[PDB]
Amino acid sequence: ERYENLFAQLNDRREGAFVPFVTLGDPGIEQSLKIIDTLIDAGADALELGVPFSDPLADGPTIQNANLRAFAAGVTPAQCFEMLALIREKHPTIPIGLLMYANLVFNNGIDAFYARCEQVGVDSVLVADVPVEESAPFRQAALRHNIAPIFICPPNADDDLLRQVASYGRGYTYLLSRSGVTGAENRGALPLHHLIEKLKEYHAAPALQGFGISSPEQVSAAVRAGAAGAISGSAIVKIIEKNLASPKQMLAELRSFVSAMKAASRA
Amino acid sequence: ERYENLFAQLNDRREGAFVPFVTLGDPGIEQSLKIIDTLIDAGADALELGVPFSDPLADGPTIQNANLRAFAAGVTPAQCFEMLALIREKHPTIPIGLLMYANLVFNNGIDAFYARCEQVGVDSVLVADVPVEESAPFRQAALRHNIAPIFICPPNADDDLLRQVASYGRGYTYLLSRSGVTGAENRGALPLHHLIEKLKEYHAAPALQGFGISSPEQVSAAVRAGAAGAISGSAIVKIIEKNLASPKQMLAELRSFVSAMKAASRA
Amino acid sequence: TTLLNPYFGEFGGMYVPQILMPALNQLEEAFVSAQKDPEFQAQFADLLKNYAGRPTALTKCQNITAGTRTTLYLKREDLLHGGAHKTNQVLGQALLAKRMGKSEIIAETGAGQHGVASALASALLGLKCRIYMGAKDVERQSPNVFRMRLMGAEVIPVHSGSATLKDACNEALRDWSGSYETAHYMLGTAAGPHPYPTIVREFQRMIGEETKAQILDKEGRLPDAVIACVGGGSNAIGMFADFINDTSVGLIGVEPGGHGIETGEHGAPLKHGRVGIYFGMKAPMMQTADGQIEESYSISAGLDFPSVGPQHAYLNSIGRADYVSITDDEALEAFKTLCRHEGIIPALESSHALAHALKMMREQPEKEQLLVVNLSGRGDKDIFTVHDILKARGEI
Amino acid sequence: TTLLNPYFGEFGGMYVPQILMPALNQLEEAFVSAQKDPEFQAQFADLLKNYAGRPTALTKCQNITAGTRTTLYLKREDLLHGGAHKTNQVLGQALLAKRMGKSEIIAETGAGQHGVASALASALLGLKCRIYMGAKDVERQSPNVFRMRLMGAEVIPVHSGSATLKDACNEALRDWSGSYETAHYMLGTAAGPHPYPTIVREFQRMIGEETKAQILDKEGRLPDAVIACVGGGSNAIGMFADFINDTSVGLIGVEPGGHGIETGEHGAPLKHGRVGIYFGMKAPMMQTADGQIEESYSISAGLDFPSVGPQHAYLNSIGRADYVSITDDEALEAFKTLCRHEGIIPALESSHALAHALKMMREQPEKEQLLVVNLSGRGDKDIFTVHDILKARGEI
Numbered sequence A, B: 001e002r003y004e005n006l007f008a009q010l011n012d013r014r015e016g017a018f019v020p021f022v023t024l025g026d027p028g029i030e031q032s033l034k035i036i037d038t039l040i041d042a043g044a045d046a047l048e049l050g051v052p053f054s055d056p057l058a059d060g061p062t063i064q065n066a067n068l069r070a071f072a073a074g075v076t077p078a079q080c081f082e083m084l085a086l087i088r089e090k091h092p093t094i095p096i097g098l099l100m101y102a103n104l105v106f107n108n109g110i111d112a113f114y115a116r117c118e119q120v121g122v123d124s125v126l127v128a129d130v131p132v133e134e135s136a137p138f139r140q141a142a143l144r145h146n147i148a149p150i151f152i153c154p155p156n157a158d159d160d161l162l163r164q165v166a167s168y169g170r171g172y173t174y175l176l177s178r179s180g181v182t183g184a185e186n187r188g189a190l191p192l193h194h195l196i197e198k199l200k201e202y203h204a205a206p207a208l209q210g211f212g213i214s215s216p217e218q219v220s221a222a223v224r225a226g227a228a229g230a231i232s233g234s235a236i237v238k239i240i241e242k243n244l245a246s247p248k249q250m251l252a253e254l255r256s257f258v259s260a261m262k263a264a265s266r267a
Numbered sequence C, D: 001t002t003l004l005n006p007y008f009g010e011f012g013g014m015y016v017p018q019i020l021m022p023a024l025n026q027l028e029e030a031f032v033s034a035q036k037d038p039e040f041q042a043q044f045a046d047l048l049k050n051y052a053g054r055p056t057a058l059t060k061c062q063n064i065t066a067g068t069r070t071t072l073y074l075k076r077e078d079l080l081h082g083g084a085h086k087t088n089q090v091l092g093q094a095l096l097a098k099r100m101g102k103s104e105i106i107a108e109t110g111a112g113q114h115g116v117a118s119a120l121a122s123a124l125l126g127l128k129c130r131i132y133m134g135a136k137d138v139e140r141q142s143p144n145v146f147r148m149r150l151m152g153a154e155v156i157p158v159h160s161g162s163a164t165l166k167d168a169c170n171e172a173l174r175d176w177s178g179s180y181e182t183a184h185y186m187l188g189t190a191a192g193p194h195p196y197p198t199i200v201r202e203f204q205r206m207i208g209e210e211t212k213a214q215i216l217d218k219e220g221r222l223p224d225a226v227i228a229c230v231g232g233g234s235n236a237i238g239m240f241a242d243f244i245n246d247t248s249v250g251l252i253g254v255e256p257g258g259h260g261i262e263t264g265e266h267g268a269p270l271k272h273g274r275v276g277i278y279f280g281m282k283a284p285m286m287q288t289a290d291g292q293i294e295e296s297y298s299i300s301a302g303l304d305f306p307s308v309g310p311q312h313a314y315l316n317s318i319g320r321a322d323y324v325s326i327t328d329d330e331a332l333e334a335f336k337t338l339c340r341h342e343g344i345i346p347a348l349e350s351s352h353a354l355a356h357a358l359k360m361m362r363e364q365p366e367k368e369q370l371l372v373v374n375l376s377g378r379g380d381k382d383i384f385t386v387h388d389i390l391k392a393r394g395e396i
Ligand SMILES: Cc1[nH+]cc(COP(=O)(O)O)c(/C=[NH+]/[C-](C[C@]2(O)C(=O)Nc3ccccc32)C(=O)O)c1[O-]
Pocket: C083, C084, C085, C108, C109, C110, C111, C112, C113, C114, C115, C165, C169, C187, C188, C189, C190, C191, C229, C230, C231, C232, C233, C234, C235, C236, C301, C302, C303, C305, C347, C349, C350, C376, C377, C378
């Protein structure tokens, strides 16, 4: 599958993965598609993609405002799935992961949601407000439709939680940089070496560190500590927010940022 | 004494008494003196005179505003006594009664207050907020200084109260037209014949009816019912209030009103 | 002729126009009869318990006394229905009014607390209630005015004089003097002509009775002192009454010092006035040299009255009770301290009593003393007054 | 793995980001331990009695039921310190927070009642309190905001979404997800992730326990029904809990109908929404066809929440409890009726429950029925809202 292939290729090249996040449809459907193509062309190894949700309880103001811009353009989950299909048609091998809130997965049937993910070529789904303790119907539906269920390893994880995330997760493990919500200005500085080592000991899916990653130095630190890669969202979205009136400068600044962040993942 | 002489003369002439009330010093000391001389020259048989007090709990808005005008001119009780002395010097026989609030009598000594009344030639004092039940030190001080203590016969008087007012009062008995406070617009219509007859049976001082008396017809009704006379205050004070800017028209309208009210007292 | 003594030493009496003496005599007679009537006592008790919420708590304040040898309890009249002790006596007075066949109620109010209490009792018990309130207080207390009106009371602004409580008092008594056949005057304090000082005390004395029982249960002894603010005297005599014969218990009443006694802008006649005759009673008054009644001042509209009830004047004269004063600024500091350190927002009236207690503690912090402050009401009504002061002073 | 069942049938759970599960597990553990700890129970009881004023009265309303066979009692949580039932559970939750070594408190509020309660408990018990409040509610509730600030709480306006309670809820949970090591989230209702629905019920169940004892004493039997408004579910489950096993006692919850269910402007997810996952729980929600959470509406900011606690959803599903709705106008009429005929100014929240009781009486006036309405708070906070409505409608 796409994650296993990616991480194998990156390991052969002694490379970490750089995985940007954007909200689908921000600031509009067409510009969002151009944005995503620019992120790929600039060196993104995989994608994390959000579906706009009315009450994103795990996101800070930057991604809250991305959702609002998307809603202002009329973006719906159905339109997001049409985008996902187009993205996959253009890019057959890049891993595509969704970051979802539970109600959008549950609303019209858990099984049906994962069936649609499979139809459009999504590789993984992380449900931000479904902990391992509540994940059974989500992970079963994911696996039934060849979707990797993604679980979070938080910095306060105990050994039992480490063993659960290692057993139940697939594709990658989401290693949180810190407590709190998403935010480029809040950089996590707690050393995560111990958690990275336990995950590997327990044969967990390779770890991608996320939350607060906004500079190339943070990407290098994550890979150097043993993570398989790093995720950056708010830092990317701020470039969108800053250049709403200059769509071309937006893409150029996104390319520069992505290229620099990916360069820092190379060892 | 002056009341006994007056009522004897009026009875010989088959006349009731007309007794106007004004507040001393309203609207000023000099105009107040001219007012009082006009009331006498126009036919007043006796005078009732108020000393401005800060909180006149037995007076309606008309006489409240008279007090305020007096205070606005700086009128003090001491100045009121200087006026009383001048009035008596001009008019040796007219009965002069004060309408007082208790604190002004009590403030610097009950005995001293009545001593000053005697010095200036006052004939009687009615303390509006001292009922018979509390009157002992007031009536003793009055009698010691040859001042008649005046008591009120209210329309709800019981027989015991009738016998007390008859025994303790001198000069005249104040027969209330009605409950409430002073006010020319509120005319009392309860028949008072019964109370007038009991007072006479008990040898009370002759009754002067007061409160709400604002027209000659009310004066005639009081005398016809057996009262020795009638008191009118608010109706007089309204003439002052109406003509504050025309001092001469004020005196002319006061003369007309007093003359008509006194005419109605003649049988 | 009266059934009960109208005087407390030199102070008290019935200095009303003669027209009102029968109303006062009827009220006294009805009260004496009601006090002996077990049905009346049972109905009053039922309303106090199941409608107003008696008994009220006695709360120990274990943050404000830290580091001292003062133990401080607050008697929580702020938890009574309506938000203050006034509700106790309005319930009794309304029952007396019905006992006498009266259908209407006249009441005065300052900040609006007695107005609210009168309005709520009249709504419950089927009486037509009209409330006189100084126009300056109306302008500043539009919330309590609307509460009174929501409960069906007529609220009548009074624009005369200082347009505060004394002026509302005057108008209420003028009204009663022409409406006593159908209206009961629900006087709001332990002052005015007999029998009001006695009736109000007896319908407020459960405060001290409960306090005594509660302190005995919690501490096993009587307080060293009980402390209450004094505007007219109701809340203080309700706390004091049951302790008067307990000679070891200090009784401390707190008059408003306003801007400072030396400014003349205060409401402290008991200690800084002189005896006069006004509002139906012989009592200490703020008055001019000539005997005109002076206007009082206090940040607290409920203490803004230039006289005081005669029993307090008497208890002071004989040394049984001691009276002190607390300024606007001292009351404000006590208000803020209780909000922040005990989570209780007290009335600005009651804040005067708390301020004196805090002074008793702070001045002699190693003195062992067990004190009870009568927390006569809650301060929700006062938050706008406090806000504007703190805004003008740059504090917020 | 939990010590207690997180579900009520299909409803409930712990749908929070993984980072918060240890905080929830620690809270559950602390609660289970505290419930078995006689020292904790004694301290909680002492605060409830001597600080908050429990037990609260049960008042019979003998004017509003005239001419019918309805007997109506009101459980007087409006007489609790702070003015509403919220004070019960904040005292328990604050003690839990101290038991867990937390020094700070996060709380959400709508109209400000839970904010005031959280602020007062934090002031008493030495905790640093910060309150999230929708900016539209802040603008309309400046008095309660100032009360919170007087008691030392930080009040943080929330401008996102509808700028009402749901949005304050979101921000509080975002905050907690980065501050749980030092801050306890003092959730204000019987909703959210386990263990909050259970903890809030257990710290509010004295309402029904007292009500049962009081009704047995006065009437010698259980009520035919107990009636409570439902915004999140705390006051209703506190009344219901002790009656659940008394199968003859009807349990009636009243959601806000707002401008009318048919307008979509209401807060009645239990009967007019559908199950979803949000605010940490699986519960009935107002939501779009796509699964976006809808904004609610009610005249009462305390009922303006587009979900409901899971135990109510469960009690409804099995038919043990029945849920209805009451519109803005119906609540306003009940508010006015209680003010004018019983002299009690009720919260606009509680006015929904009273309105349904009045409907039960008026629709079948010869039906013999003994009803208890949970008068969850007083309406002093609401007089400005009511004034502006009555002004706009030309009524005043
Ligand atoms: C919470 C609280 N605590 C203490 C007091 C002080 O009054 P007391 O000295 O205890 O009697 C409170 C005052 N309430 C009143 C004022 C009133 O009492 C009243 O109604 N007529 C009247 C007449 C003369 C003096 C005082 C009063 C109001 O409505 O403004 C109050 O509200």
